[PDB]
Amino acid sequence: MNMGLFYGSSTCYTEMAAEKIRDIIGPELVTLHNLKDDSPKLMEQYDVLILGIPTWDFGEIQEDWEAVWDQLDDLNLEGKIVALYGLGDQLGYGEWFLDALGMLHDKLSTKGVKFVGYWPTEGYEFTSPKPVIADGQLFVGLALDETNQYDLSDERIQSWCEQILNEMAEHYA
Numbered sequence: 001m002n003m004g005l006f007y008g009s010s011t012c013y014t015e016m017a018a019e020k021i022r023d024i025i026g027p028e029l030v031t032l033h034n035l036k037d038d039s040p041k042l043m044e045q046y047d048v049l050i051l052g053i054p055t056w057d058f059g060e061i062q063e064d065w066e067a068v069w070d071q072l073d074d075l076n077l078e079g080k081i082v083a084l085y086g087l088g089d090q091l092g093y094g095e096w097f098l099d100a101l102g103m104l105h106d107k108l109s110t111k112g113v114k115f116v117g118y119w120p121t122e123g124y125e126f127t128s129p130k131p132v133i134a135d136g137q138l139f140v141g142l143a144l145d146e147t148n149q150y151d152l153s154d155e156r157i158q159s160w161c162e163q164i165l166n167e168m169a170e171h172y173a
């Protein structure tokens with residue numbers, strides 16, 4: 001299946017993660033979409049999607065994601081696989097770490113999607129109630145930080161990619 005990597009970035013952080021995800025999984029079948037210029041309507045075509053939101057200004061969404069957040073309700077995503085990923089920082093926040101991630105998860109759960117890319121919350125710092133499932137033991141998506149985890153965020157992407165490329169494919173078997 002062809003898969004759509006969607007993101008929005010004010011700087012470059014979500015962009016660099018996007019390149020990595022598509023690269024690791026396979027640019028044969030993954031395609032980047034830069035929502036600060038691309039319309040999310042093309043996300044209706046692709047069988048499977050991977051969507052990435054940075055949490056800005058204390059639990060705000062990145063400003064270019066806010067621009068398409070309106071259309072996401074109108075789109076056809078019903079029965080699509082979605083892997084969420086998100087960016088923030090633990091040291092300055094924790095409380096607002098991945099807050100936008102929880103918001104897309106609650107957005108796209110109403111869109112009748114199926115989700116991949118959970119991680120266990122152990123060995124991380126957040127204590128926020130939003131980006132978590134089960135009993136709060138696993139995150140809704142890949143969680144990154146570029147303010148101090150910049151040394152390892154790269155390694156966490158690839159390992160996340162190594163599961164989502166199974167979770168999506170094994171669903172589709």
Ligand SMILES: Cc1cc2nc3c(=O)[nH]c(=O)nc-3n(C[C@H](O)[C@H](O)[C@H](O)COP(=O)(O)O)c2cc1C
Nearest residue numbers: 009010013014054056057058059087088089096097
């Ligand atoms: C003014 C400002 C506010 C931020 N607000 C949050 C926040 O609410 N939660 C969080 O965990 N990180 C926060 N961050 C960290 C960013 O989410 C993080 O750097 C992210 O990678 C931004 O991605 P982007 O620039 O590609 O859009 C903030 C950063 C700045 C500069």
